[PDB]
Amino acid sequence: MIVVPVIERALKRFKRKFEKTGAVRELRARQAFEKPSVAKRKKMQK
Amino acid sequence: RQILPDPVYGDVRVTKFVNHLMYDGKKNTAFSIFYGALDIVKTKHSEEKSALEIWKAALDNITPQVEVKVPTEIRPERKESISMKNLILYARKRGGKTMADKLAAEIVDAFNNQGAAFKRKEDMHRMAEANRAFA
Amino acid sequence: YIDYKDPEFLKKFLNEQGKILPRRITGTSLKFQRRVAQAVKRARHLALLPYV
Amino acid sequence: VVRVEAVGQAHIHSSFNNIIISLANSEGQVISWSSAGKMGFRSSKKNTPYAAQMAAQDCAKVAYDMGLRKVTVYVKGPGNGRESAIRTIHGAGIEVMEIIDVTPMPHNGCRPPKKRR
Numbered sequence: 001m002i003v004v005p006v007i008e009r010a011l012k013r014f015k016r017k018f019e020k021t022g023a024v025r026e027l028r029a030r031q032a033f034e035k036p037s038v039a040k041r042k043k044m045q046k
Numbered sequence: 047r048q049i050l051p052d053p054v055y056g057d058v059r060v061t062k063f064v065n066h067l068m069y070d071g072k073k074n075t076a077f078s079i080f081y082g083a084l085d086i087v088k089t090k091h092s093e094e095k096s097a098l099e100i101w102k103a104a105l106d107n108i109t110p111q112v113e114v115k116v117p118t119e120i121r122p123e124r125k126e127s128i129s130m131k132n133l134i135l136y137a138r139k140r141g142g143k144t145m146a147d148k149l150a151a152e153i154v155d156a157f158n159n160q161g162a163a164f165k166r167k168e169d170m171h172r173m174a175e176a177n178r179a180f181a
Numbered sequence: 182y183i184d185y186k187d188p189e190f191l192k193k194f195l196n197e198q199g200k201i202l203p204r205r206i207t208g209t210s211l212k213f214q215r216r217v218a219q220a221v222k223r224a225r226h227l228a229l230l231p232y233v
Numbered sequence: 234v235v236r237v238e239a240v241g242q243a244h245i246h247s248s249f250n251n252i253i254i255s256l257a258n259s260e261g262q263v264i265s266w267s268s269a270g271k272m273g274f275r276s277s278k279k280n281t282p283y284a285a286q287m288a289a290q291d292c293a294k295v296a297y298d299m300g301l302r303k304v305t306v307y308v309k310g311p312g313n314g315r316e317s318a319i320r321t322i323h324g325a326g327i328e329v330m331e332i333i334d335v336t337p338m339p340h341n342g343c344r345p346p347k348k349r350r
Contacts, residue, residue, distance in 0.1 A: 001198065001233055002334035007323045011316050014332045021198060023336050027311045030339065032348040179274070179283040 054081065055098060059126075066130045082146035087153050104156035105129045108163040110170050116180040136162040183216045185223035188230055195221070199231050237264055240303040240330070243322055247312035251279045254289050254318050256296045256304065256327075265296035269314075285314025289321035297326045305330045309337060 002021055004014040018024070052060035060080070068076035088097040095103075109129040113120050120128075133152060140162065142148035155161035184190075194202050194209075194217050201221055204214045224230050237258035246253045255266040269284035272291065278284060304327045308315050323329045 002332075004332040006329050006331055007320055010329070010332065011319060014319075014334075015316060018334060021334075023334065023338065024311045026338060027336070030345055033345045034348070179278045179281045181283075 053077075057098075059102075060098075062126075063130050063134075066127075066134050079145050079149065082144075083149035083153065086147060086150035090150065091154055091157070100157050101153055104153045105133065107159060108132060108156050108161075108167050110167050112174045113170070114174050114177060117174045117177055118181075132163045132166055136166070183213075183220045185220045185227065185229070188224055191217075191221055191224055191230060195230070199233065235262055235264055237262075237299055237301050239300065240305075241301050243304045243306050243327075245306065245308045245310075245315055245318055247280075247308070247310040247315050249280060249312055252285050252288065252312060252314050252318065254285075254292050254322070256292060256301065256322075258301075264299055264301070265292050267292035267295070280312050280314060282314045282317035285317040286321045289318035290325055293322045293325035293327055301327060303328045303330055306332045307335045308333070309335050311336070 002014070002017045002023075004010060004017060049058045049061050051058060052064075054060075064073065064076045064080050067079060084097045084101065087100055091100060093100070105126075106129075109125050110120065112118060133156065134149075137145075137149045137152040140148055140152060142151060152161060152163065156163055194207065196202055201218055204211070209217065221230065225232055235258070241256060241258045241264075242261065244255045244257065246255070251269055253266065253268045255263050257263045267288040269279040269281070269288055272284060272287045274281065274284040274287075304322065306319055306322075306329055308319075319329065319332065
């Protein structure tokens with residue numbers, strides 16, 4: 001629930017807030033299913 | 047490369063047009079064709095203008111603006127080259143008695159804003175406006 | 182013992198969206214971080230801080 | 234039978250394939266809506282800022298002549314063009330009050346549908 005009360009400055013602020021929150025990253029993650037083994041091994045490799 | 051002024055009008059655009067018009071290195075033949083065509087142009091549309099002014103206006107009328115490589119802007123040199131090439135090519139394609147007559151007819155049509163070269167330019171404009179999103 | 186009350190104290194470890202900040206962002210150590218997370222979740226259950 | 238007096242809420246529902254912009258009054262009753270598919274962008278270009286701008290302009294023009302003057306923006310879902318839509322409805326007469334990202338996120342709810350290969 002990112003709120004940017006207020007046009008170019010407001011839009012840049014909203015985009016920056018969304019990027020900081022990382023909603024698109026979690027949306028891309030939730031688009032598909034990942035096995036717990038896959039997640040654990042990705043974390044171990046990273 | 048260097049371009050000689052035209053002997054009659056002292057222009058480089060005229061020499062470039064003749065260079066586009068020339069076959070097999072016969073520049074005298076190309077010059078004779080161009081001067082003849084201007085003569086029928088001035089004898090037919092005799093219009094509160096000149097003979098070379100009508101030709102320049104025709105080239106400006108049939109020149110295109112943007113070109114889809116996605117649409118993009120066109121350099122002035124490529125714009126002029128494509129305008130001259132289109133005029134000559136459609137003059138060759140169209141029917142008529144002599145090349146001078148065909149070229150004069152096409153120049154007059156381009157000035158009067160209708161013709162095959164104008165149709166090609168309008169089609170290119172439509173194909174350019176079709177892809178405004180990817181630009 | 183961090184109390185699940187004092188929500189104003191509790192926001193010291195939360196971000197703008199109300200989530201719990203990582204232990205690496207601040208200086209917390211593991212035991213204190215666990216206690217902070219437990220207190221935050223207890224207060225969320227008690228409707229003292231928002232879930233979102 | 235609708236009545237939007239002065240202010241309302243704009244809702245943007247975006248995805249990886251399409252964007253839908255729908256303006257409504259304070260009771261969430263839609264008065265106008267538009268989308269890239271309605272604008273006629275049936276291609277991969279449905280998720281383009283240009284398509285979003287076109288849809289937002291059409292919706293704002295359709296809804297402005299009804300008493301709508303001020304609007305609050307809600308955004309759900311990802312996808313390019315949300316900024317373009319916000320800018321277009323801001324510049325098409327309607328005045329924006331705040332930008333709110335209502336994109337729903339789960340606290341580990343149901344199972345997502347597999348993974349493409």
